[PDB]
Design a protein around this ligand. Sequence first.
Ligand SMILES: Nc1ncnc2c1ncn2[C@H]1CC[C@@H](COP(=O)(O)OP(=O)(O)OP(=O)(O)O)O1
Ligand SMILES: [Mg+2]
Length: 528
Amino acid sequence: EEAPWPPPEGAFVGFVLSRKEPMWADLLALAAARGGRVHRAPEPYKALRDLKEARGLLAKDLSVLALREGLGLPPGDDPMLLAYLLDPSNTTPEGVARRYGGEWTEEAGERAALSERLFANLWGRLEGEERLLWLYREVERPLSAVLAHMEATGVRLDVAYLRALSLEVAEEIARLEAEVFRLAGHPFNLNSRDQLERVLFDELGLPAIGKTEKTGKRSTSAAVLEALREAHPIVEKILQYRELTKLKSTYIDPLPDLIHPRTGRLHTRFNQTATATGRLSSSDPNLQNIPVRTPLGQRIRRAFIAEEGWLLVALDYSQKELRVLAHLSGDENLIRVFQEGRDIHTETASWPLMRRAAKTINFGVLYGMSAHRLSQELAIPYEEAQAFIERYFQSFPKVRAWIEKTLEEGRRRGYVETLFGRRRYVPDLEARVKSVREAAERKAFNMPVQGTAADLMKLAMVKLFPRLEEMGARMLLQVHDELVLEAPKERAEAVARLAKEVMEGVYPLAVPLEVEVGIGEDWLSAKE
DNA sequence: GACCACGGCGCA
DNA sequence: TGCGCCGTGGTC
Ligand SMILES: Nc1ncnc2c1ncn2[C@H]1CC[C@@H](COP(=O)(O)OP(=O)(O)OP(=O)(O)O)O1
Ligand SMILES: [Mg+2]
């Protein structure tokens, strides 16, 4: 079985990395498998040149590493993408192998043979699933290539800016900590939620709103604290200390230490097989959760900058998931708001900012928000919130109808579907415990929405990418409903016009897709 | 050194 | 609703 390297063309590849992150990994071993043969390469890096496409489990990763090494080696078939389309709970090679007749090993050879067999079985199970087959060829498989090029490109970080910002923020943090300690009458580890809990609820006269989920301690979460705002001057200082040490410990300090030596840029991983709805995730580091909603957060966004001679182009679908819902439900009054190009969190507010009472709820229909989350996060009475939630479902009848429609059907089939037929199996829809059944219901009806928006965005990236190469531009990040591009300073405005139209027309619905676009020297300014 | 559970929170 | 990462407390 053991044939000499190189392997027959179009064989399944296995490979061992020294660590998960392709951009930081040493390629320990490389092998291939085809026609019941196993070809282990004598020297991994050398053998990498002999490939025309990575084909096998985790193809994108190997391709990202090749790309890092100058080799233009594109990802192709991946048994992982197939498994993920069958059941999005297939997020792992350990899980997938086990499930479809293999064993995820630490040997490149056994991994290559695992890639061959696994693909055989998985691809057979997709014979009969034409909509899932359409997604795999037209969206997923091509997408993996686009993602390999985003991961290899990276985004430029303003290191010295973050260094200086760390020093400023550390001083403020010290001031908040000293204030908190004076109000507490004694020092303690303010990072420790346990010690904090004793201080607030025991030593002080503070009431305890709620409990934590797994161990039932008195919660010191932000929600609980915002309620205790007026109850004591220490609370306010703790809210500020929380925000500052969150942003410092998670972004300001770690990010500068991840610049790659060769490239001088920051490289995330876009996980294509991670979420239950069809969305991408990002890790090592996560760049889909860089701060923005706060002033300190926005100072962190500025750190992300264009290469010298380039600009960033930030494109951003407006009310993406809402528009998807209008199309999925077929609700008249809702479509005739987007078609009239009318403000959504204002024209929905007309059925003062009795208008964020339109936004925070528009968001809270997708998630299945309860009258509570609404009132207690809207700073108004409880039944003032309930009235709002019923006034909304009066204006938009077919929404309620689509939600119930989707749940009934998901009970019978055991799964739900995006506009394109991406599935998520939801088993507890017939659980006999109300809280479990109803939790199942909320992820069941949210999935078609969220996952359809993700399908549209994925398809938009697959269509946009080739147009960018032609124009000398590059795609840097995706944040669920936003894209960040990088273009030569001279063609920025042409690229912005173009990317915008590609995204708006990705797949026409019963409602228009409006995209906002900004250009700037940094991520903050590129969003107008 | 690695890893785990938890509470907590950054973003969409 | 969907993620990934932080420090703390803790095990191995
Ligand atoms: N506070 C929140 N809670 C839950 N989901 C949220 C959220 N904020 C955003 N999302 C999710 C849901 C959709 C998306 C929200 O993006 P935009 O904040 O930009 O809201 P948009 O609909 O575009 O209206 P615009 O604000 O521009 O007036 O991320
Ligand atoms: Mg927006």
